[PDB]
Amino acid sequence: TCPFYKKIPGTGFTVDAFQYGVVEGCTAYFLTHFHSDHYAGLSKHFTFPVYCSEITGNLLKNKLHVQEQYIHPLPLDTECIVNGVKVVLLDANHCPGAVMILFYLPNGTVILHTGDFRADPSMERSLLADQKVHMLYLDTTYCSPEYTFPSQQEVIRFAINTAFEAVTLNPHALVVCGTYSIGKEKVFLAIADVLGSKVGMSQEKYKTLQCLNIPEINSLITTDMCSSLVHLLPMMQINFKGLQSHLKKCGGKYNQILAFRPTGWTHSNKFTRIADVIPQTKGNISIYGIPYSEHSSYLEMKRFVQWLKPQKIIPTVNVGTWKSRSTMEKYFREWKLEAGY
């Protein structure tokens, strides 16, 4: 049964609610982004209308084989009418195709559902600026002040400079980057660009990337691993055993691996600056954990909410424990009292 925080009151609508069978009363199912916890339940047999971005719709059709007649893509930043209700999709600054959804209820209430997002000041000048929001369904993944991490730009600068240094010292070093979902493509694209290489990957991953409308992509990626010195592998293979085995397959072309695991937050964030990060090393293999986040830090989240001034906040992440829920409610009250709404 569908939980309350996936239902939009006063509408026939649900958000990210595909694993509950036929939801009673639901006339349109929205999907914020193509990550498995959110799409769980969709397949070629789904026969209700699915509303989403163009990029999410490319992925539904090509990866999950959802039939085209049930996919309803909407343009961003554009007032659209769905089953008699005005909606807008806004960029969530998460993975490719990820959106926030603004719903203009028939009774005058305005609701923003952030999906998964990384808040940014740039959102304070979208169509959110123009009216009041009464209810906020909020991505609270890192809603505690211990969650700090650098900007995406600082992290990419670190990775570029690290990869370029190592491969200029040793032209026989291979760079490997871990992946398990869409998102974080800038990591491996920026490294391949500094090295003058395409990114090599499996057919399945190349297919996924060909759905994302990235400009000039045919210029940046390939399935020919032998032509490439930046390879992508499954995240589960980014360990000493998995990397040793990969280096064997490369046929004496390389004699060293430098590998990257983009994680979200890890507790080495509470002590160490990005400039100071060091790898784990065994023999000719080094592994860097880099804190490239596609979710809001605590400070970014706070700033967005204090700017928006919602009347009510409904968390959509960390909702399963009373200690989490109680923590989050305390922070929302602090924020409200400090800013005065």
Amino acid letter, residue 139: D
For residue 262, the surrounding DSSP H or E stretch is strand 256-263
CB closer to Ni ion out of 200 and 294 = 294
Overall size of the chain counted in residues: 341
CB closer to Ni ion out of 56 and 269 = 56
Q: Are 102 and 112 in contact (CB under 8 A)?
A: yes
CB closer to Ni ion out of 39 and 188 = 39
Q: What is the DSSP letter of 146?
A: T
CB closer to Ni ion out of 117 and 254 = 117
State how beta strands 230-234 and 256-263 pair. unpaired
- Whose structure tokens read 């343009």? 75
Cβ of residue 183: shortest distance to Ni ion, in angstroms?
7
- Greatest distance between any 2 Cα atoms in the chain: 68
Q: How many angstroms separate the CA atoms of 89 and 169, rounded? A: 47
Cβ of residue 33: shortest distance to Ni ion, in angstroms?
6
Cβ of residue 2: shortest distance to Ni ion, in angstroms?
19
Q: What is the DSSP letter of 237?
A: G
Cβ of residue 115: shortest distance to Ni ion, in angstroms?
8
Q: Are 119 and 93 in contact (CB under 8 A)?
A: yes
CB closer to Ni ion out of 40 and 80 = 40
* Contacting residues toward Ni ion, per CB under 5 A: 35, 116
Cβ of residue 178: shortest distance to Ni ion, in angstroms?
17
